[PDB]
């Protein structure tokens, strides 16, 4: 009931809508018809307003064929359009009807019924006949109430045969507020306070009279429904949970939506707040008018889109923060007006007018809106029976004219043909309707089967610094590993703790002893070690201070120091340790060398050399005796196109993988040199005056050194990126790959915005297999953070799903995948909650889940 909305302010895995959910799209007469003075159409206030306050449009009135084509392409069930009143009744009074306009609406209605599309017909979408503004004052004069009911009566009589869904007025809030409050809309009276509320009053009363008209005289033999489309915005409190911010939030909502909803969908009166705040500006319903307003809508038509949001004078925000959260808005309607049936009568956003058909953001705005509606239906039980995307085609967007576009279909207004081209959102909304929700198509069904008996089941941690069971450090770790059925453990050493000099002339032997103790205790648990020599983090670069101050990784001698460190660790641990990662994610170490674009490429060259020197040392001097294996970890998030209808975004997704994985993988795995794609792309944007960076060619000696220096392929995979082609300026590494990212705010994500996109790991493994062949692959890091400190449902979810796709890559795709290391074992207090154990070493639920998988070698039938 009134006021119940304030409550609003004080793992979702659904993709598809209710059976029989109802998909549509909308237009409004004035935006799309054109032909404003054609075949005896009377002028509207909006015709006068444009030719006074401003300076063919989509020309639907002559191209009905072309819009019926677009409707068929989308596959919508309903189409919502509006009858231009002055095209029927030039003087609004119902003297002789203009038979050519009646022919147009009749022809449209016939075509929709024969294509099985339900019409939703809107009587009044702001284009009041000019003659009623001049003779009467338009909605200021209450004689309009019967002038409007007469017009509806004819419309029911001429079309009710074929129309079962009727809207009286589209968004009466803007009619009153911008027509007479702000002057932004026809007729353009600014600051007229008394008009605003008299106009609103006449619109309410006219609607009610049309509802009762329809209820009595047409519903029995036509059996349709009538509502009114109430627009509104949404608002959230300035301060977190400020009790009076919340009260102002409620005031904002009432002032826009309650003003018209409370008479029609509520108790039959204006909102009590308004009645106080406006005790004598605001008209009064008699107690009998109160009983004939209550209930004059057969459903809640609701509009939520850019016109209730911009310009800033459209609503009173009352100091609290603006919001696009449609789910909460729908919830507000549910509590205020007691869970009615909702049709979303208008929803969408807008794109800049120089975007033609590649409307990438429009897709993600549509995805986000649709997701909120599905949450509303499923989580909150809100009776949303239908969705009207907005709008079918580009047209004249009221005071903005043609400076924004809102159509699912592009119209070049400078061409006579005015063809309707499907934008990317038209492709997207098409598939949405086909599948009745989110494309359930990139998600293959679960496999039953098992990993081979010799698969590595790992857990990873990062750098451990030194302090056998003497060492308290190692006890607490063993207590954690004892609760895991993992067979491998992956941990990093601290280069600066072993050789504080960075030279072998000063070895911390206590530090090696602590590391050895870590390996040897783990062998007692029956757990093998994979030791990472160098694991740079944001917080600690990891270099011994002398080589940091001597230019770090830009200094080629830093690569030799690393070889000295590698040999030491191979010598003092290699009898115990059979798996080695030289460097963890050197490809993402470019960002520390942010400055020159040639700076990040040089540091990466010395990083490749460090690895190849360490690896050759092992291969020559330590493998014969120790018979272990050595590689490095690459960060390897998957990439898909942001806009999948843009051939340019497909190419950007491959370029991303080139710059991310092939940068290191191509020389060290396959050819001893940088990948062609990368050298050749950096060629153009420097041969085309955009970047002063060169990717230096590598000496045939340099080629020889790096080629073939990996015993297996190691990948740290967490998420999938959605990438856009965008030509960037500058010469930084980021700049040369010409890539921007789009966060799909609608996917199951972690606190830190890691997307759960399981099938990305399967695509990655096959991309790796196909570029670098049937060499062995270990996933050396895989995880996600999670707010939950005992029941990490998101980690459990991620782990089950991604491991299921790894199984698919093994059983179905035949990728030589040998191991999975989960990320990570424990978490530090300031740091994102990535651990299987809390900072206090308490175990989370996912441990039992990970063990169960390990015990089963997968997901057996």
């Amino acid at each position, epitope marked *: 009931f009134s006021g119940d909305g304030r409550a609003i302010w004080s793992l979702f895995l659904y993709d598809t809508f209710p059976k029989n959910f109802f998909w549509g799209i909308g237009t409004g007469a004035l935006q799309v018809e054109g032909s404003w003075k054609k075949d005896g159409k009377g002028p509207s206030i909006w015709d006068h307003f444009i030719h006074t306050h401003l300076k063919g449009s989509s020309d639907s009135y002559i191209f009905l064929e072309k819009d019926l084509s677009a409707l068929d392409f989308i596959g919508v069930s309903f189409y919502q359009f509006s009858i231009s009143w002055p095209r029927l009744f030039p003087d609004g*009074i119902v003297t002789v009807a203009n038979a050519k306009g009646l022919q147009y609406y009749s022809t449209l209605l016939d075509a929709l019924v024969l294509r099985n599309i339900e019409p939703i017909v809107t009587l009044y979408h702001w284009d009041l006949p000019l003659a009623l503004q001049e003779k009467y004052g338009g909605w200021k004069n209450d004689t309009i109430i019967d002038i409007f009911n007469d017009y509806a009566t004819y419309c029911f009589q001429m079309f009710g045969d074929r129309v079962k869904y009727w809207i009286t007025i589209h968004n009466p809030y803007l009619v009153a507020w911008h027509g007479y409050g702000t002057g932004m809309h026809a007729p353009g009276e600014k600051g007229n306070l008394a008009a605003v509320y008299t106009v609103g009053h006449n619109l309410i009363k006219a609607h009610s009279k049309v509802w009762h008209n329809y209820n009595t005289h047409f519903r029995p033999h036509q059996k349709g429904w009538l509502s009114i489309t109430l627009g509104s915005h949404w608002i959230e409190p300035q301060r977190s949970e400020n009790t009076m911010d919340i009260f102002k939030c409620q005031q904002s909502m009432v002032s826009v939506l309650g003003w018209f909803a409370n008479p029609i969908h509520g108790d039959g009166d204006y909102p009590e707040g308004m009645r106080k705040k406006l005790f004598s500006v605001l008209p009064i319903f008699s107690e009998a008018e109160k009983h004939e307003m209550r209930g004059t809508a057969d459903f809640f038509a609701f509009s939520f889109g850019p016109n209730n949001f911009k310009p800033l004078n459209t609503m009173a925000k009352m100091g609290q923060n603006v919001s696009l959260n449609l789910r909460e808005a729908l919830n507000w309607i549910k509590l205020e007006y007691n869970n009615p049936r909702i049709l979303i009568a208008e929803n969408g956003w807008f794109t800049d007018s120089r975007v033609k058909t590649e409307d990438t953001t429009a897709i993600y705005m549509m995805k986000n809106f649709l997701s909120q509606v599905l949450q509303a239906i499923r989580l909150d039980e809100i009776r949303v029976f239908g969705y009207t995307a907005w709008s079918l085609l580009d047209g004249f967007e009221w005071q903005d004219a043609y400076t924004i576009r809102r159509g699912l279909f592009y119209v070049d207004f400078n061409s006579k043909q005015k063809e309707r081209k499907p934008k990317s959102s038209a492709h997207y909304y098409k598939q949405i309707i086909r599948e009745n929700g989110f494309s359930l198509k990139e998600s293959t069904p679960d496999v039953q089967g098992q990993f081979p008996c010799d698969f590595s089941w790992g857990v990873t941690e990062s750098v451990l610094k030194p302090e056998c069971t003497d060492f308290v450090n190692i006890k607490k770790q063993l207590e954690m590993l004892a609760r895991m059925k993992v067979t491998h453990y992956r941990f990093a050493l601290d280069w600066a703790s072993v050789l504080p000099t960075g030279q072998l002339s000063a070895v911390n032997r206590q530090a090696l002893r602590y590391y050895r103790c870590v390996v040897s205790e783990g062998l007692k648990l029956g757990i093998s070690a994979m030791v990472t020599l160098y694991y740079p983090t944001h917080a600690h670069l990891g270099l011994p201070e002398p080589l940091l101050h001597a230019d770090g990784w830009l200094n080629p001698s830093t690569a030799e120091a690393f070889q000295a460190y590698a040999g030491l660790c191979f010598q003092e641990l290699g009898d115990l340790v059979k798996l080695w990662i030289t460097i963890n994610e050197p490809n993402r170490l470019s960002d520390i060398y942010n400055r020159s674009g040639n700076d990040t490429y040089g540091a990466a060259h010395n990083l490749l050399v460090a690895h190849a020197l360490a690896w050759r040392l092992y291969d020559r001097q330590f493998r014969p005796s120790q018979r272990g294996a050595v590689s490095l970890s690459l960060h390897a998030d998957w990439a898909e196109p942001a806009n999948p209808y843009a051939d340019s975004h497909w190419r950007a997704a491959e370029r991303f993988l080139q710059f991310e994985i092939a940068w290191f993988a191509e020389p060290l795995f396959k050819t001893g040199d940088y990948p062609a794609a990368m050298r050749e792309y950096i060629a153009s944007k420097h041969r085309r005056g955009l970047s002063s960076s060169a990717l230096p060619r590598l000496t045939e000696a340099e080629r020889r050194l790096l080629k073939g220096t990996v015993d297996f392929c190691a990948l740290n995979h967490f998420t999938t990126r959605f990438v856009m082609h965008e030509q960037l300026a500058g010469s930084r590494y980021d700049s040369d790959r010409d890539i921007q990212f789009l966060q799909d705010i609608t996917r199951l994500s972690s606190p830190t915005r890691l997307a759960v996109i399981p099938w990305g790991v399967r695509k990655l493994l096959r991309w790796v297999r196909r570029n670098y062949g049937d060499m062995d692959i270990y996933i050396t890091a895989s995880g996600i953070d999670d707010q939950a400190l005992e029941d990490d449902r998101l980690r459990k979810y991620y782990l089950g799903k991604y491991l299921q796709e790894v199984l698919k890559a093994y059983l179905i795709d035949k990728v030589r995948i040998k191991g999975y290391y989960a990320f990570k074992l424990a978490e530090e207090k300031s740091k994102p909650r990535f651990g299987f154990f809390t900072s206090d070493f308490k175990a989370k639920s996912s441990i039992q889940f990970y063990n169960k998988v390990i015990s089963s070698r997968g997901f057996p039938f």
Partner: nanobody
Framework: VQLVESGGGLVQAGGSLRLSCAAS?????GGWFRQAPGKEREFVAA????????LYADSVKGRFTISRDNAKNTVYLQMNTLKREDTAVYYC?????????????????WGQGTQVTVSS
């Protein structure tokens, strides 16, 4: 659809008279025509379903007013300052489509006719 006129009769010139047409479902346009012996029926006045639209013949604009009460299914013609030029048989008409038209082929149902006579 049956229509019935009421309130004809003889009136002194310059006097006043009020006809009503009672009907016996849907909305309709109420019409009024008058016919003199040997002349074609002439349109007098009509009224839309909720009275937003009223039309009159020029020869009666100012003197005649049409109105209706949908609740009683009755249209009224209030004739004031009657001339001898107003003597005729007066027929009420109904038209179903809520469009106010002035020619007689556009009305579907017709009343029996009531005589109005203006003498001095």
């Amino acid at each position: 659809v049956q229509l019935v006129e009421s309130g004809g009769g003889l009136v002194q010139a310059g006097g006043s008279l009020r006809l009503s047409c009672a009907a016996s479902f849907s909305p309709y346009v109420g019409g009024w025509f008058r016919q003199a012996p040997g002349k074609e029926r002439e349109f007098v006045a009509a009224i839309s379903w909720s009275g937003g639209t009223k039309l009159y013949a020029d020869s009666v604009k100012g003197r005649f007013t049409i109105s209706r009460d949908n609740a009683k299914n009755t249209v009224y013609l209030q004739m004031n300052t009657l001339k001898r030029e107003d003597t005729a048989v007066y027929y009420c008409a109904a038209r179903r489509i809520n469009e106010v038209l002035t020619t007689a082929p556009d009305y579907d149902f017709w009343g029996q006719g009531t005589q109005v006579t203006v003498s001095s």
